[PDB]
Subunit: 291 residues, 4 copies
């Protein structure tokens, strides 16, 4: 019941880089208005790693207030620290999120056994809430093999995997070995191909400004209209090429600003500002997006 | 007219590791009776880098005597040396192949300008036959960017790209920037996902024993039957799982010996023999496929 | 004056994983009793990335109260977030630390410019105090090019570079490029060869249990006696080989325990515990080191 | 008897890319005049992978004719194919070389056992001449582990290891495990540090134009004069810095040409010509090298 298209919610900030509560609620409502199935909060896209636990706990709360009931809620609780991750997991259940999620602890090299204990400890604190293992090798440096995945996803309490890997052979191998596992496609650039390989849903950053397109891809593939699926994916990637140039997060925010959703499209340092030269294209994208 | 499903032809050897002509002719006929759109010969799968220019040219001649007119024929003439590649290319033209192809020169690092000159020289010796740029990072050690690809595929005489990369984001980008370029999916394990992202056909080594499934996945994606495309793809991946454990070339060769096509299923040294413990699975697969 | 051998300080924890104030002070003096030139505190070796800013700030204070004036004190203030790093920077100034240091912000990919602003900001909040750039690709995932390193170390306020890279050609290039820059050799296993390549110092985690050996390596070379510099390095590596098998940090805290310095050789989660099998070997080590 | 400083011999070609016999002999005599301990012929630097077996056997003969008895002679017989490697190993014995060498087979992935049989077979055909295992991860794509190094180095008939790796931790680990093994440092840019780490001597391409500097580094270390040892290494790295910018083989050949040792400074295709803008620095360097 938690399989589907979930947006990786961004964390709006004000001019002083503090949480822009008013913009956060507006973005959540906006995401809901696009027909998204749920919000994955406190993830990489939410700039959680340059946030304190308190701030992250705060976001979970506001979003739960604005969304609990409307759509599905998944809280990314991950931290390098197990203890910290347990701490946020508790807040997750306490605020009624439908699921908990944690990125493989990074920076320091951890054995497969240590990763399992990390997830066990967190699952424990999630007190019931199912765990969504988060695999994103490009940002974490943890390149999980098929076997390590097997070990992690078969952990009592795990109900899903956020596969942010462009290896679609592994994507189908994972589906084939775990026919009952919820598979989220992490890379928006390959959504259509991800679903075809074995993913039954997705979680992406760009869902925030065009989630209906990804939903459209699910419909077309479901309906057998491969042509339109490619048509939509092509259009998504034209947007993604741009966002990668301008900076994805700041690019997304900037677009939401012109859409009247975000007040100040700033990210937290070390993230820098959007190149002035890019605002015409972003505003334009925002323009057409309001379709 | 190069668009389609081409089998990366294996090179049968006898007990003394010399070319097994009869098995070669047998293998070519087997592929044709299988409904393949053509053959890509002298490539990685053909163990070309473990053959002499003389041996590789002899293969081109035999295959031409057996398949010219029947199916499309692409000759992989690529060597590290430009001069050797040219020699093979003139031999390709002389024997009536439909096109030539060449892996990006490896071992020694070369600049983009040097790869272009390498392809220009070969294209020149190809005297008319279109060129198939062959990108296979995993083996060559040459990781091309979207930009370099652009430059290589826009070279006069270049008519297609054999993409043996699992980066399906890049695959669609290549399709978007080059709408008319023939794009071959290189990794069999992701054929379906490849086609959907922009590939208009493919070249693979497992097409030798089950190319009909790939043609099958093509028809399915054409008739909008995603259901059948997936079913066929996962079946193929179950095979690839096995071949990857036994050794792809040797494995495929053993299955062929069992299908009564190849007299001796050996690969050339340093490639070792198939592990005894694997023969049951390969026998069963042969049996399974024969029906 | 930041030149010399500096031990990368570990932060001892009790059974509940809380900071072991007693053992911390005890460890500091032990390092001094060894004749160390200074301490690099709050870094990777300090399990800093599994601590809160509050805990990191506290450790800074403790250590200072114990060593300010006795030896050189460098404070690793690195955090992904710039604002958090700035906060820890002021605390460094506040407790009279000699220098500040910060790992290249990781996980999220940042541009050279972003990394620059990041360091400037921290240099600013350091209210003076020279900045020690910390380059450790294997943990941060940031592979700095000689050019990028050039941009970072010529930044106003930077007085040193902690090179935890095994590339000794780059090391000598850095030295040749910046004759006035302090170069700390990062990997203990190549200390000798590191100083020979151009490093005039070094910061290591194993210094905590045998800093005198590294001090002896420095002397042996300064005196033109390679023969003993090697013997020492070989010895150090015999140790490091072991520590690698057991888990560098946990292994070190264990040896320190067998040396009555640290109460409980525990690292925080997800860091697991030492292997019961590797205990005796670690005991013998602690035994030999005491001489 | 294989300990020492061996130059990795270049292969001079004429304007039509054919072997230049007169120039090959001069380069041999030239290296001998430099007081080089021996020559490593038919290696990467010799452009062997763009030559035919016939051509590589011809280079072997001529060099033997010019140097057998004068200095040590090692014949790089490596090819991907085990059979071709044996054929060349036979020429080696046939022509009086003191040893054979083979790069780890590349392009196709081979098992450790497969690599072991490759060497056994080479060694068998080497008919008595010892084997020098050649490890160069960067070009081959084969990053052997300390363990695989042990298995290969302990093979019967293996008398040395050409270590073209910048990992000086592994270098010392190899010296430690195999004290009676000849260890050739492979990267000229770290010659001083490699030796200190444990290297017995070295093999390099820049030895062709400045072997004496490397011989200097050796004597400097043997005499406990680390000061001049670095000076020499710094000078070599300034040259290497340039050679890398212009193209190492083509650069060395151009300098040699300006020293009147070789007629045409050409490398074979796909290697391109030296950029005109670089000739000034190359002529200047050749001037001082001649002094």
């Amino acid at each position: 019941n938690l399989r589907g298209v979930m947006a990786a919610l961004l964390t709006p900030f004000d001019q002083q880089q503090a949480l822009d509560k008013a913009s956060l609620r507006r973005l959540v409502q906006f995401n809901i208005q696009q027909g998204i199935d749920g919000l994955y909060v406190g993830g990489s896209t939410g700039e959680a790693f340059v946030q304190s636990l308190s701030e992250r706990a705060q976001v979970l709360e506001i979003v739960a207030e604005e969304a609990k009931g409307k759509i599905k809620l998944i809280a990314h609780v991950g931290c390098v620290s197990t203890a910290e991750s347990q701490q946020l997991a508790a807040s997750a259940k306490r605020h009624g999120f439908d699921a908990v999620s944690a990125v493989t602890p990074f920076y320091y090299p951890f054995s497969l056994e240590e990763h399992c204990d990390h997830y066990r400890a967190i699952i424990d604190s999630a007190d019931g809430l199912p765990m969504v293992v988060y695999n994103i090798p490009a940002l974490s440096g943890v390149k999980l093999t098929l076997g390590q995945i097997y070990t992690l996803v078969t952990l009592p309490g795990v109900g899903a995997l956020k596969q942010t890997s462009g290896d679609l052979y592994q994507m189908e191998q994972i589906r084939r070995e775990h026919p009952d596992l919820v598979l989220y496609n992490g890379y928006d650039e390959i959504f259509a191909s991800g679903l075809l390989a074995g993913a039954d849903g997705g979680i992406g950053s760009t869902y925030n400004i065009m989630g209906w397109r990804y939903q459209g891809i699910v419909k077309a593939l479901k309906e057998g209209d491969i042509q339109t699926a490619q048509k939509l994916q092509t259009e998504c990637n034209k947007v993604i090429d741009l966002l990668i140039k301008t900076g994805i997060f700041r690019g997304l925010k900037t677009v939401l600003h012109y859409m009247d959703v975000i007040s100040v499209p700033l990210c937290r340092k070390p993230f820098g500002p959007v190149d002035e030269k890019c605002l015409p294209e972003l505003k334009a994208l925002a323009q057409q997006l309001m379709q």
